[PDB]
Scaffold this active site. Sequence first.
Site, PDB file in Angstrom:
ATOM      1  N   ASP A 130       0.967  -1.139   0.008  1.00 28.07           N
ATOM      2  CA  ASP A 130       0.090   0.168  -0.039  1.00 28.07           C
ATOM      3  C   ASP A 130       0.714   1.346   0.031  1.00 28.07           C
ATOM      4  OD1 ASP A 130      -2.758   1.269  -0.068  1.00 28.07           O
ATOM      5  OD2 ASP A 130      -2.968   1.067   2.131  1.00 28.07           O
TER       6      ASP A 130
ATOM      7  N   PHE B 192     -11.768  -1.757   5.373  1.00 24.41           N
ATOM      8  CA  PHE B 192     -10.860  -1.192   6.231  1.00 24.41           C
ATOM      9  C   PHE B 192     -10.747  -1.931   7.432  1.00 24.41           C
ATOM     10  CE2 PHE B 192      -9.837   1.462   2.676  1.00 24.41           C
ATOM     11  CZ  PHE B 192      -9.291   2.592   2.991  1.00 24.41           C
TER      12      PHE B 192
ATOM     13  N   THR C  31     -13.201   0.427  -2.554  1.00 24.85           N
ATOM     14  CA  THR C  31     -12.653   0.929  -1.324  1.00 24.85           C
ATOM     15  C   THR C  31     -13.454   1.637  -0.311  1.00 24.85           C
ATOM     16  OG1 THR C  31     -10.323   1.728  -0.693  1.00 24.85           O
ATOM     17  CG2 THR C  31     -11.779   3.251  -2.159  1.00 24.85           C
TER      18      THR C  31
ATOM     19  N   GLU D  86      -6.970   5.312  -7.959  1.00 25.33           N
ATOM     20  CA  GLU D  86      -8.290   5.740  -7.732  1.00 25.33           C
ATOM     21  C   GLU D  86      -8.770   6.923  -8.475  1.00 25.33           C
ATOM     22  OE1 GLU D  86      -8.762   5.591  -3.277  1.00 25.33           O
ATOM     23  OE2 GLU D  86     -10.633   6.685  -3.401  1.00 25.33           O
TER      24      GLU D  86
ATOM     25  N   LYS E 209     -10.035   2.062  -8.714  1.00 19.49           N
ATOM     26  CA  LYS E 209     -10.315   2.271  -7.165  1.00 19.49           C
ATOM     27  C   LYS E 209     -11.470   3.249  -6.930  1.00 19.49           C
ATOM     28  CE  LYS E 209      -7.689   1.830  -2.931  1.00 19.49           C
ATOM     29  NZ  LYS E 209      -6.181   2.079  -2.318  1.00 19.49           N
TER      30      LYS E 209
END
Length: 322
Positions: A19, A182, A160, A100, A136
Amino acid sequence: AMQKSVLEQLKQVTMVVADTGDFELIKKYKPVDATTNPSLILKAVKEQKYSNLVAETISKVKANNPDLNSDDLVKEIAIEILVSFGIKILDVIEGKVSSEVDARVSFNSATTIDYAKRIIARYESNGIPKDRVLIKIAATWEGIKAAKLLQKEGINCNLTLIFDKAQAKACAEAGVYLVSPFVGRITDWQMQQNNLKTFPAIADDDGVNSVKAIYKLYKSHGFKTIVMGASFRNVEQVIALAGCDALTISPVLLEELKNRDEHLEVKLTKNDDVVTQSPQISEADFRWLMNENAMATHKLAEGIRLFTKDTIELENIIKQNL
């Protein structure tokens, strides 16, 4: 695994993902895939490490787009930067990179699709096929709707900012390639709401439990969407999810895992539980379920705001460097 580090052992049971937008760090961990987001892109641009790459991208875009006004030029530079970092990442991994969409289109399915296609087109123009990219998208109802259409056209998405099982279920029902539930931000809420002086035990960790619940939901229902835990506060949270389809981890925690050497016990595994299938969740049921979850309502909204703030900062950096 022949007395291997926790990181090496973890790679045997879970797809390890890095990440970060800092592609030079990726080589020391050898992940399968990598993930970026607007905050990570801002960080990679703002730091001096990749100043040359940033300068070159700005120059190239200005030269190839002399007819754009300042606002349009900045947006075009922002998307090429996103893609440039994605390409540098692809050069050092065998898998896919997640890029994203602009967080400002999170409540507009049509413009999310437009932005997703623009990202794909910039990668194509740079010789990168879509099979190596995941678009994303924030998992708002609109984002899920956009992903449903994108997947029908062969564009794989990474949904996400997932904080509730309802989001995860609608994503799977939309045929989404992968979801990023998450962990850390959920644990943050838990610790503040309950005034915890120390980190909760794994059994009591709301974030770890959220991923465990989504994993169970998916496997029991035979959903093929990849479950990828994201956002971690410590290695213990990562280790507790060993066996999950995938886990995306920061360079700081990957370094810790690389230096941990105890035996790794696998926690998530496949079962023979006969698959069960329920009716798809409607927009109204999804919105109700999300509303019932105070934490999820807050953190989804906050996540979008934070990414937006970081995108605006990036734009300002670009404007100061024209």
